[PDB]
Amino acid sequence: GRNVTIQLENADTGTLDTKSVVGLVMFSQFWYWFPLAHFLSLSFTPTTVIGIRGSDQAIPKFQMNCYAKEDAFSYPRMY
């Protein structure tokens, strides 16, 4: 639904995501066997900040400041 990106690597340490490597080597071989296409899923990662209230373990509603040009990253059209 337009919420996922393919990461090269864990973004925290700067060091490879185990799952992401397996996805892409498996994806690249599909000429030989077509069903293995699906392995691109392990490479798919959701990208989103989810703030978690440490006093309930639930998702608080609140608003955060992003200094950016707001219109410049507008959500995609519907084709």
């Binding site: 989103t48 703030g51 209230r53 006093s55 309930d56 998702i59 608003q63 992003c66 950016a68 990253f73």
Partner: protein, 58 residues
């Protein structure tokens, strides 16, 4: 920008929760997409929540 909404990696840099608000991170912002545990100043006054959906379906 609302909480629990699509944030591309590029807008993630600029993300900065209001200091004056109740929600202030317990450490310096992680700055990268992911669960960031926040300290709520006041449990007395209402905190509107989004209850996780898995528990309803389960």
């Amino acid at each position: 920008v609302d909480n629990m909404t699509r944030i591309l990696p590029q807008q993630s840099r600029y993300i900065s929760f209001i200091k004056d608000d109740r929600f202030v991170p317990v450490r310096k912002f992680k700055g990268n997409n992911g669960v960031v545990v926040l300290r709520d100043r006041e449990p007395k006054e209402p905190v509107a929540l989004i209850e996780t959906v898995r528990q309803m379906k389960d």
